Amino acid sequence: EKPFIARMIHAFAVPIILGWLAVCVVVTVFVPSLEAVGQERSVSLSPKDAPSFEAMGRIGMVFKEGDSDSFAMVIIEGNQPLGDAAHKYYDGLVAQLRADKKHVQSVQDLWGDPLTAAGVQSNDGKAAYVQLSLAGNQGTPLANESVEAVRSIVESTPAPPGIKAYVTGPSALAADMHHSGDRSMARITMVTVAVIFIMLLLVYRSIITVVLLLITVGVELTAARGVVAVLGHSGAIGLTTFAVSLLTSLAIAAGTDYGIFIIGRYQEARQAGEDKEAAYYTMYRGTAHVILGSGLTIAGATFCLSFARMPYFQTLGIPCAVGMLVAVAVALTLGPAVLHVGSRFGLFDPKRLLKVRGWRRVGTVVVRWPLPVLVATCAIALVGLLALPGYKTSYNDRDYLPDFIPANQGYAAADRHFSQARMKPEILMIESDHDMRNPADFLVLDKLAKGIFRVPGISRVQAITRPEGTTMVFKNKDFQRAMKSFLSSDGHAARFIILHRGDPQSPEGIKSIDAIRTAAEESLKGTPLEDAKIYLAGTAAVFHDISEGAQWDLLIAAISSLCLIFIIMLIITRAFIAAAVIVGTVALSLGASFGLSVLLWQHILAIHLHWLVLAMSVIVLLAVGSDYNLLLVSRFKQEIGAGLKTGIIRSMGGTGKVVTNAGLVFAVTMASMAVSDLRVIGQVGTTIGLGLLFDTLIVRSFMTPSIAALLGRWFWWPLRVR
């Protein structure tokens, strides 16, 4: 049989090649580079419905401390106790920062006040800092512009001798994370292509076939990146450096996998003795639907991230799905077309011999004695859960960027002279219709401050009644400036600046948020301010919410992706238990990938996994593992009719080397993102790489064939097979 679309691609091959190339050039010229769009259409880090976001907005609006979620800390450091020259320079800097109303919405200038100066000066006296509130939420282009403007102002002001200034804070850290992620993109792609070229040259052993495969992959990659850039430029989608990097790597790996499937089936058909036209038609009949299933599975898996809560997951839905729906159509059309055009000149005939003796022997060893093999590999797959009790997630984005980053460099200026919690303050605000100016409510405020000072892990409570944060007046001249910054202008609300001992952001620190809330409630209970509203904001509260939401979004994304992949495989194969197995044998095998990744990062390298890693890696692992299993099961579907068990052996003999090559190429592509400056991207890539090595070496090789041999004809229920 010669299927229709195969005939049409066969007749119009050269026009198709030139059409896709023209589209590539048109898109690359008529819209900017995708990374440039990412820095033009980036998303805000915080979700909108988070209490830690509403609280910060409310505090900012009530206390007139701007209208943004973002805040940035300016650090002043010196090689000696800061003299009056430091104060003059700081006054000039704060005046200039105030002049820039477009970006700096407010400046919590405390070091300029001799009274509260002790509350921000380093205990050594060699450093000081001031909190700025910048327009635009964390990570948005407005915040990026604001942090760049503040940084330029700080670093252009003439520093006195022996004094240095830095900029820090979540906003600057996010901006620098974006810029460093887009700075390493060229290197990621260069190393990916170099490694693939060094690898594929040892598989096909002729440079022409490798070069044509890589050109097909490049056309796919550029078309996908270009379409996603078009959508981003049109404003229909947000973006993040994670989305761009994952899209690039996934497009490269998946395009190489489709090209490898195409060439592998064509070369097997040629080795069997079929001529060029019949070989191409067999290639299409045996790989056209496998590639489409592979594309839709990955697209609908990465699309399931669109249901996540956190923006760092929610924004990976549309861009990745569009990139994979583009890279697949280009694969399905340029692949067969370029294959046929090259077949005119005899480029894609196999140079080596497609020896299959080893895989047929393994197939007869696994089909015979299926259940022992299934048990033997289920033991390996499930022992990866032993790392679960010791798994510890780290929320400190500060550590996963290079030390030369200006934001990270500024943080070092705090560690050298401050406790590591000073640059991560947490703010508690109480609001009521009463006027807090009255002395009785001031005693209530003091009771609240004392109560929260008792909370574990809390070191300092800088408040209206605690100008320097330590234990100790409403009419004094210096105390008036405390009114100007620690009570609302109407007197209806009061804010408490809270500092921790140790990192507030760590899993230990964030749990204190509930303790702080409870202690505040006990202090306010049985008191006239009991009716006063309470809000919590800062890094601690923010990442407490992130910890709460990440579990749910990971779970929902994983479950939805599993169901969608199952539906796609059921459509492709039309066998219920078959489709169930194709994805179940991968879901069970997620334990091995998780265990290996934890054992490599957390235990061996002593680097905890970033909270993004599992969510961004499981979605790809499910899809790609199910794709390899789909290839194998579709080959079963083909070869069956020569015996239910013998077809399994023949199918392994045929597709054994193809899937190994595709799996190694994909895993090494994902494992090549460790080169990225964002160590978070490195963790994601390495987790997916280890997982897919496990799949391609064990799951599809022993689990699926063993289950197929065990289930007899029930593997294809309801399909009637003799």
Next chain:
Amino acid sequence: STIEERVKKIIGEQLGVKQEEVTNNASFVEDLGADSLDTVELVMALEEEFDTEIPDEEAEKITTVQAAIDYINGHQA
């Protein structure tokens, strides 16, 4: 065509043996250099060439090609 022709076909395909090379008098292990797993795969393949299951102990009677032909001409029933 006849049973013998296509059992010959499967033996040849399993062992990589040429059509003119395989013969009734030849033995799988010595003359054709067949492996033990090759014999297991070959018997399993005949189990689906004809709907007849061969017990493991019954696989002791498959030493040579002529034995396979004469065994399966009767056990095809």
